Design a protein around this ligand. Structure first.
Ligand SMILES: */C(=C\S(C)(=O)=O)[C@H](Cc1c[nH]c2ccccc12)NC(=O)[C@H](CC(C)C)NC(=O)[C@H](Cc1c[nH]c2ccccc12)NC(=O)CN1CCOCC1
Lengths: 211, 243, 253, 221, 247, 241, 228
């Protein structure tokens, strides 16, 4: 759970050919059925190649984001380098399990790029999903989390297409998110979709249902 | 009797002075020169590199200028190990402020915290002070571009242009007679090169012994650049043409 | 300064004089111990003598109780030389280390690991000024999981090393030469021997080394011999009768 | 989950399924349940995935530290002691049922460890929700001194039984063969489940079909 | 010396602990305490000759012999406070051992634990080492008698007869003239009185009966700690005085 | 679970079943409930497996410490120097059926110079169990030999009490069914064969009547100089009627 | 009570750190060379007597895969710092799932070493450390001094006659040398420093090259290298 139902919210992540995408619902709820905000973003940028989508209790989302920003900033200032996506994923797992017996009520996903050096650099899409105590699912196609997990799983199982350009990836992820949100009472009121490409990030707000 | 071995570091002297702090200041003044100045385009921090050997990895190796945050950076004069300890602490402090307030710490506040650490060391306990002095430059939207100088006692003061380390009197004279309220980044860099050459007692600076960095605020973001050898060499060619 | 030799702080030349003084204190006890390593066995021989100190050897003193050899576990043994209180303290520290290792890891510590842990404990004494150095130098013998004899020696300075043969005593270089000669003589034999013959030869070599180093005839009652081997992995003392048999054999051969 | 292990001649063979479940929903289709503790020691986990992952990582790194310090080969008994002491300390609230198998000086060894901190040395074992089906297979077919190939086939059969008879088990069969000198981790080993129906063509949405309110483009430098 | 004897945690350039040596001097200058193993028991005697000028002390009130479990004698020579502290620790160790294992602590285990306790105070630069030498003894039928002496440096040694404090050389010389393994404690009392009279020059027939403590563990006392009754001590005192007056 | 201990004329015999079950499922078919603390000291465990196992590990650590501290300095016993066999193969023979079912080892400490005492180990175990009787729930039977009290049996009961038994001790769910059988059949100064048969029959009856008791039977015979161990697999109970 | 035993002198120096440096400079020599595709650390490990077991003395040690450490100074200090470095490496691994970075490990150990020049009741560590490693950012050779300062070296030597050894190594070091050339140059430098004649029993070598696990060369491999 009821604590997740208190606010609602859902995050989704998909991979394409040399691009990734992370989408979220923009609602903030109260008592499971009162909408107080329609611009509560659940996607946070850690660095150029790492994004985290946090869904769950809003206070826990904000707290976890502050902790993660603190840790990432310290790591990056010390190493004089951007934090690796795998390193961030493992650190998030360990942070979540550090509160094993009084956990943060947040179900996160990590979406980004793994950089491989040879001259040029290769960008490999990277997706992970978590449960509230840091159990990690590393995936190559799509990751979901939130109260809309079942709907998102169904939509992504049916509609995900491997190795799509940024345009097809955006269309697929947005369609999945919108169809999954249309069936959830406590999620929706706008959708935000980010498409990551090695050279640019495209941020779009979807014309969604507001009921 | 373990007290026979105590040196009583945190104790006043007949003249109302702290011998340990005075000796730490002597060490700082023996250290190599670190200059800083403020232009209308940013804060420039320069330092003289002390030669150890040509087997030292000179690429991607800045040892006298460090980044404390995206909007704060510092130059060091004194003991490198003490400086590293204090720099790690300052980075922790800046990140703690961001964690607490969701905004970046002001440069004055960070300086106050690190100087408070130093003062506490000089007052409490029986441990020696830190043999390091800082030139902390930064930018924030409250006070603009800022440059501060901190000493082992915990004292700090704000400056428009200053120098610490060995032969800082010559650098201070050069900056006093050359620095201007409105300067461009290139002009400030050239002045920094001139003062470094004067302090080092040389005419043509050598890029192998110069550390240069500048912190600017452009397009709504604070950007720090630590000039490489080739960039410093281009600057030195410009300086050679100028003088 | 005025305390570079009083505390464990560096002297201008870079020395720590308190460690050297602790080594001298160990050397002043005038107790000699010799450890030898065989093919499948290790032997430690020591004097059943009281370390020279403020008190002397009384007529009513029980001489069986005088010993510089201890069991750390059932299968690990040691000989400790130095100030007797320090030696007892070190023996108890080693026993507690071995027991903690056994409980924590589900198997028995080996001699190398025990010696290294003891030296890690000694380093703290060398580095902190508020505590005295333990004037104790130790030999440790055991058998490892691969069935090889292990003989290690640690000194007050926190230095440990494995040896084919070692000696704690006042004279060191001549003792080293004596042990080298004995080991070369043993290696000059080219015929493989049984476990019992190896045990007997290692024990004889240790007894002969101690006799040569001390330069006087040894009585079985004034020396103590302990052994560990593959046949019997328990660190066990050999009887005075066996010691006397070995001494008579050495004299007659 | 269906994890299992058995001892064959001079080797220990562990097997696992690859399904992680969040209630009635499959949260992960290809999760890895066999974890490397050391070159000669591996484990298979059942129970709460977060507890299992954290505990196995902690055990692996502590064992590596111990190996570096002692300069000797890690011991299955040491792993058992550490794991059981931790689990007992937490009184079964770290829900970790582990099949720990490895080869050391004492030869091949297989242990079953339960969340409350009990352990047992076994010739074969199975844990998880499919443990009863796997145990049926193992009890029916196990014998001493099986060849490595026979042990691999038996572990595959046990894991397949668990996969196809337990609703909390599925995915592929992962196997690990541990000897005194090497380990072979085959992932996947069977791959017995795949989606059986596919549409004639994938559904590609035409460009511009999704209505948008705003679009901001930023360039990464 | 030369600045190296101002602390117990510093060795001198010749590897010595002068603070412990000074403690040894202090103990040697103190009252006498001897223990003697006999055929049927052990006798512990304490000669408090230092109080020959304290004429207002309650008679026989000052005792330096204690017991641990009613079957272990423990006496000392040195500072009363330090010895009392060490005896309290010995009793504490005995209590803990019984709590843990439901049997009495063995004598050698207790001796080792007390040696470690005493040795711990010779290691740090902020604690004062104990200035006391301890004698811990016991007797039973099967094992006969066990006597241990613990020095201020933490060294414990086993004896069949021990003397600590002042005049200990003379006392040892007189004790070693006979083998007490084949003498009974009742007969040894007279010998000890003679030894005291001959050795200690501050002791006479007048003050023998109020400056001497006598305890034993023997078959007569059921192998449990006892103080020797005046009815047994007085005839021996008279005989010893008579003999020494004869010669 | 069934654990038994019996004192016969020349030693002490411990026996146990080997079934560990989580309710009605048998998690371990053949567990090891008689465990060696020292060469001359054994414990039979009953109750929660985790509790008894962790307690026994702690007690083994303590007993190692005690044995090390029990050693005296010097040499000893220089002039001093320190029967019917069970037909285990015949006992185990089954018509319808490299198997090792018997072990024997002699004590290294022949004179019991440093071996800890059975009472000492039992009482430290009791103290540990009593300090945490709010959590721990296990029952133990210590069987041992020491030169002071010879062969001994100590029962450490649930809640942390200790009772020394001079005839026999039983524990576990299956012991209830054989309580009167053992009381009727026990006698003082039994021979080794009589004690072996009696204890084997007790475990067999307990396993026949108790669902929590099963598997094979493990027996340990502790004497003055050695310890023997047997495994019995012919555990089926056959009644004429 | 705890007070600093290392204090500033009237001229602004820490004589205790100076004396620790004196101990290091009197100790035996060690060196490290960064090659084009790897990094080696060599050290001179003489045998004080024929009875010691050379295989028991460990001067070149492995902190983790792809990270090795050698020292010049006091073996007890080295063992303490080596245990601490291994603990820090596994702590980083537990946090971040990957192996620790050489720069991060060097910074942590340098801070630990610094703490002992300022805290109360302790003396500074009497050794210099050479830490070689490989990570995604390349090949690293770092030196750590008793003061807690660390230096990034292309090639370096610590211990006895380190000035002469550094001059000799600089006269024949270029950044483009290979692993074989680096090993040859290391053996040459050790031979030049050592009085007498060198042999495989007197030296130890560790290599981290081509993203392979850190390796400690055996006596046979060192003999093969010394044949030339
Ligand atoms: C076996 C099943 S079982 C019935 O025998 O318990 C598996 C074993 C398993 C799964 N994954 C791994 C990885 C490594 C080793 C072993 C593994 N166990 C499970 O799948 C768990 C069974 C439940 C009954 C405990 N499931 C989980 O732990 C869930 C995993 C999960 C949920 N959402 C996710 C998103 C991404 C990745 C993983 C997951 N987690 C939970 O049920 C969360 N609860 C929250 C409360 O505290 C306990 C864990």
């Amino acid at each position: 759970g009821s604590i997740y139902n208190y606010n609602g919210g859902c995050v989704l992540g998909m991979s394409g050919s040399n691009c990734v995408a992370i989408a979220c619902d923009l609602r903030l709820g109260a008592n499971t059925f009162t909408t107080v905000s329609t611009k509560f973003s659940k996607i946070f940028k850690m660095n150029n190649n790492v994004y985290v989508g946090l869904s769950g209790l809003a206070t826990d989302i904000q707290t976890l984001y502050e902790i993660l920003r603190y840790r990432v900033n310290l790591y990056e200032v010390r190493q004089d380098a951007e934090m690796d996506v795998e390193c961030f994923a493992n650190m998030l797992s360990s942070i979540l399990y550090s509160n094993r017996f009084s956990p943060y009520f947040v179900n996160p996903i990590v979406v980004g790029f793994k950089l491989k050096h040879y001259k040029k650099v290769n960008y490999e899409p990277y997706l992970t999903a978590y449960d509230l105590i840091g159990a990690k699912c590393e995936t190559r196609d799509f990751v979901v989390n939130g109260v809309t997990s079942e709907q998102l799983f169904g939509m992504c199982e049916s509609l995900y297409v491997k190795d799509q350009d940024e345009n097809g990836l955006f269309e697929t992820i947005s369609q999945c998110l919108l169809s999954a949100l249309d069936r959830d009472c406590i999620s929706g009121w706008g959708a935000e979709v980010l498409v990551l490409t090695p050279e640019k990030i495209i941020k779009k707000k979807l014309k969604a249902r507001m009921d | 009797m373990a007290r026979r071995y105590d040196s009583r570091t945190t104790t006043f002297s007949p003249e109302g002075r702290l011998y340990q702090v005075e000796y730490a200041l002597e060490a700082i003044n023996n250290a190599s020169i670190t200059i800083g100045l403020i232009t209308k385009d940013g804060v420039i921090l320069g330092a003289d590199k002390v030669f150890i050997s040509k087997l030292i990895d000179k690429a991607n190796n800045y040892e006298k200028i460090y980044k404390i945050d995206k909007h704060i950076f510092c130059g060091v004069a004194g003991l490198n190990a003490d400086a590293n300890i204090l720099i790690n602490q300052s980075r922790l402090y800046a990140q703690r402020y961001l964690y607490n307030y969701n905004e970046v710490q002001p440069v004055s506040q960070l300086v106050v915290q690190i100087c408070d650490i130093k003062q506490s060391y000089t007052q409490y306990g029986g441990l020696r002070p830190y043999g390091v002095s800082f030139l902390i430059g930064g930018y924030d939207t409250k006070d603009g571009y800022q440059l501060y100088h901190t000493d082992p006692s915990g004292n700090y003061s704000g400056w428009f242009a200053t120098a610490i380390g060995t032969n800082n009197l010559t650098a201070s004279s050069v900056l006093k007679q050359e620095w201007k309220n409105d300067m461009t980044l290139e002009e400030g860099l050239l002045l920094a090169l001139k003062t470094l050459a004067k302090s080092t007692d040389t005419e043509i600076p050598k890029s192998e012994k110069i550390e240069l960095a500048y912190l600017t605020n452009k397009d709504g973001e604070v950007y720090q650049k630590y000039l490489t050898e080739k960039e410093i060499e281009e600057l030195i060619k410009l300086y050679t043409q100028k003088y | 300064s005025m305390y570079d030799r009083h505390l464990t702080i560096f002297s201008p030349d870079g020395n720590l004089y308190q460690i050297e003084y602790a080594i001298k204190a160990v050397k002043n006890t005038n107790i000699t111990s010799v450890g030898v390593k065989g093919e499948n066995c290790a032997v430690i021989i020591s004097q059943k003598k009281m370390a020279t100190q403020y008190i002397s050897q009384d007529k009513l003193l029980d001489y069986n109780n005088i010993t510089n050899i201890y069991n750390i576990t059932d299968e690990i043994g040691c000989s400790m030389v130095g100030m007797p209180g320090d030696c007892l303290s070190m023996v108890y520290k080693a026993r507690s280390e071995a027991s903690e290792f056994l409980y924590s890891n589900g198997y028995n510590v080996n001699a190398e690991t025990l010696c290294r842990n003891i030296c890690d404990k000694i380093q703290v004494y060398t580095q902190h000024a508020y505590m005295r150095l333990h004037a104790c130098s130790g030999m440790i013998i055991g058998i490892d999981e691969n069935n090889k004899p292990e003989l290690f020696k640690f000194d007050p300075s926190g230095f440990c090393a494995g040896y084919r043969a070692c000696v704690i005593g006042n004279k060191e270089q001549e003792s080293i030469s004596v042990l080298e000669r004995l080991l070369e003589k043993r290696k000059k034999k080219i015929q493989q021997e049984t476990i019992d013959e190896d045990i007997r030869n290692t024990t004889i070599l240790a007894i002969e080394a101690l006799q040569t180093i001390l330069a006087f005839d040894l009585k079985a009652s004034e020396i103590e011999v302990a052994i560990v081997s593959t046949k019997n992995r328990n660190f066990t003392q050999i009887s005075e009768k066996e010691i006397d048999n070995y001494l008579t054999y050495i004299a007659e051969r | 989950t269906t994890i299992c292990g058995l001892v064959c001649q001079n080797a220990v063979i562990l097997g696992a399924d690859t399904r992680a479940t969040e209630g009635p929903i499959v949260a992960d289709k290809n999760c890895s349940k066999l974890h490397y503790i050391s070159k000669n020691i591996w484990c298979a986990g059942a129970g709460v995935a977060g507890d299992l992952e954290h505990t196995t990582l902690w055990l692996q790194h502590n064992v590596e530290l111990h190996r570096l310090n002692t300069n000797t080969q890690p011991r299955v008994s040491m792993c058992v002691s550490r794991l059981t002491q931790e689990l007992f300390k937490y009184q079964g609230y770290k829900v970790c049922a582990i099949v720990l198998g490895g080869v050391d000086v004492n030869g091949p060894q297989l242990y079953g460890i339960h969340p409350h901190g009990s352990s047992c040395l076994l010739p074969f074992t199975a844990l998880g929700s499919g443990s009863l089906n796997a145990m049926a297979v193992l009890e029916a077919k196990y014998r001493d001194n099986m060849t490595i190939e026979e042990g691999k086939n038996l572990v595959c059969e046990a894991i397949c039984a668990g996969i196809f008879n337990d609703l909390g088990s599925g995915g592929n069969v992962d196997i690990c063969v541990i000897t005194k000198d090497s380990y072979q981790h085959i992932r996947p080993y069977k791959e017995p489940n795949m989606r059986l129906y596919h549409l004639p063509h994938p559904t590609i949405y035409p460009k511009g079909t999704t209505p948008i309110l705003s679009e901001k483009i930023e360039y990464i430098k | 010396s030369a600045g190296y004897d101002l602390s117990v945690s510093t060795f001198s350039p010749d590897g010595r602990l002068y603070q412990v040596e000074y403690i040894y001097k202090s103990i040697n200058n103190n009252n006498t305490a001897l223990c003697l193993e006999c055929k049927d028991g052990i006798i512990c005697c304490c000669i408090n000759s230092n109080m020959d000028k304290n004429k207002m002390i309650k008679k026989n009130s000052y005792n330096r012999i204690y017991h641990v479990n009613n079957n272990i004698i423990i006496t000392y020579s040195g500072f009363d406070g330090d010895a009392r502290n060490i005896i309290d620790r010995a009793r504490s160790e005995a209590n803990t051992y019984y709590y843990n294992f439901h049997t009495n602590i063995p004598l050698h285990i207790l001796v080792n634990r007390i040696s470690l306790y005493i040795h711990a105070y010779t290691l740090y630069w902020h604690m004062r080492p104990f200035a006391a030498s301890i004698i811990i003894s016991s007797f039973n039928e099967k094992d006969k008698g066990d006597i241990y002496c613990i020095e201020p440096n933490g060294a414990c040694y086993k004896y069949s007869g021990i003397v600590i404090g002042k005049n200990k050389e003379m006392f040892k010389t007189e004790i070693e003239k006979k083998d007490y393994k084949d003498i009974n404690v009742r007969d040894a009392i007279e010998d000890i009185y003679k030894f005291i009279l001959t050795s200690d020059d501050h002791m006479n027939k007048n003050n023998l009966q109020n400056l001497v403590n006598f305890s034993w563990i023997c078959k007569e006392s059921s192998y449990e700690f006892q103080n020797i009754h005046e009815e047994i001590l007085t005839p021996a005192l008279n005989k010893a005085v008579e003999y020494i007056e004869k010669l | 679970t069934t654990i038994i201990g019996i004192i016969y004329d020349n030693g002490v015999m411990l026996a146990c079943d080997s079934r560990t079950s989580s309710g009605t499922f048998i998690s371990n078919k053949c567990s090891r409930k008689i465990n060696r603390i020292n060469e001359n000291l054994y414990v039979c465990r009953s109750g929660a497996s985790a509790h008894s196992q962790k307690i026994i590990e702690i007690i083994k650590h303590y007993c190692v410490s005690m044995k090390n501290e029990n050693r005296k300095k010097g040499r000893f016993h220089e002039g001093e120097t320190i029967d019917e066999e069970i037909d285990i193969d015949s006992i185990n023979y089954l018509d319808y059926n490299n198997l090792v079912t018997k072990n024997k080892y002699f004590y290294e400490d022949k004179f019991n110079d440093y071996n800890p005492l059975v009472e000492n180990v039992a009482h430290i175990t009791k103290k540990i169990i009593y300090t945490n009787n709010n959590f721990l729930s296990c029952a133990l039977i210590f069987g041992g030999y020491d030169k002071i009290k010879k062969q001994q049996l100590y029962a450490v009961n649930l809640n942390g009490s200790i009772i020394e038994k001079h005839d026999f001790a039983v524990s576990g769910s299956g012991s209830i069914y054989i309580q009167s059988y053992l009381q009727d059949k026990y006698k003082k100064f039994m021979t080794k064969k009589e004690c072996f048969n009696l204890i084997l029959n007790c475990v067999k009856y307990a396993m026949h009547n108790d669902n929590s008791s099963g598997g094979l039977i493990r027996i340990v015979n502790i004497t003055k100089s050695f310890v023997e161990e047997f495994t019995v697999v012919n555990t089926q109970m056959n009644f004429q009627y | 009570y705890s007070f600093s035993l290392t204090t500033f002198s009237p001229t602004g120096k820490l004589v205790q750190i100076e004396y620790a440096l004196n101990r290091v400079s009197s100790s035996s020599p060690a060196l490290g060379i960064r090659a084009k595709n790897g990094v080696i650390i060599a050290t001179e490990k003489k045998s004080p007597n024929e009875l010691i077991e050379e295989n028991s003395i460990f001067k070149i040690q492995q902190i983790s895969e792809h990270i090795g450490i050698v020292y010049a100074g006091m073996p007890g200090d080295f063992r303490v710092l080596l245990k601490r470095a291994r603990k820090e490496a596994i702590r980083y691994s537990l946090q971040y799932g990957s192996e620790i970075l050489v720069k991060e490990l060097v910074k942590i150990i340098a801070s630990i070493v610094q703490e002992f020049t300022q805290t109360g009741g302790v003396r500074p560590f009497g050794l210099s450390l050479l830490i070689c490693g490989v990570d995604v950012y390349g090949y690293h050779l770092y030196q750590i001094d008793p003061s807690g300062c660390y230096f990034n070296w292309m090639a370096t030597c610590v211990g006895k006659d380190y000035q002469n050894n550094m001059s000799f190594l600089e006269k024949r070091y270029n950044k483009d040398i290979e692993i074989e050339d680096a090993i040859h140059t290391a053996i040459l430098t050790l031979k030049e420093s050592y009085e007498g004649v060198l042999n495989e029993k007197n030296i130890e070598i560790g290599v981290a090259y081509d993203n392979k696990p850190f390796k400690i060369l055996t006596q046979n491999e060192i003999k093969d290298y010394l044949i030339e």
